[PDB]
Amino acid sequence: EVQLVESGGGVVQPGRSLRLSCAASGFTFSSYAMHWVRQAPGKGLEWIGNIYHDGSTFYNPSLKSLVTISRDDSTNTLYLQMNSLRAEDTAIYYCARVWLYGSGYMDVWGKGTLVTVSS
Amino acid sequence: YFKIYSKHTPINLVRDLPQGFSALEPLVDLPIGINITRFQTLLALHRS
Amino acid sequence: FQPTNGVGYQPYRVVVLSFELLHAPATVCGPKKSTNLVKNKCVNFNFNG
């Protein structure tokens, strides 16, 4: 059945890069658009990025140049490159999936990965 | 809209309609939305 | 349709609601959230339309 799993979380120095992976199992990776969302402890959810089958990446206007969304369809995976980490990016990250031939319901969700930045 | 107005009157006249005034209260409005051009009363037989 | 199939081959039940706005009276309306009644004050009243 449908399953999203994530990896790449941990406790890292600020300014060091990260590569968060979202592997999809059970459904064909095409015809769906993939989202990266984060939520901070004590704060609500904040949307990070979108990527489509074409390769069009759309980012939040609030945060610019910090992340890079990279889709791969040979092995049905999604990658996030995070650069110039600040102290405020301690958060739980989620991988989300919307169907391209409907409204923007995010359907099933990832379990989440923890990113803790410290000095 | 099908408006049904009705009034019950206690009379004791034998043959014709009594002469008087009685305004009919609205009883029920029906949202039917259909064409009606003909009607027929329904009676009851007495069997013995 | 089998339970071992993944998402996309699973049976989906679909109900499609279509609305009609013909010259017939609008019998179908939304719910009517009645609030509490306040007296002796200049208020905007809406009683049954």
Ligand SMILES: *[C@@H]1O[C@H](CO)[C@@H](O)[C@H](O)[C@H]1NC(C)=O
């Ligand atoms: C109602 O029925 C009569 C007889 O069948 C017809 O002449 C008339 O045009 C109808 N009216 C409408 C609005 O359909």
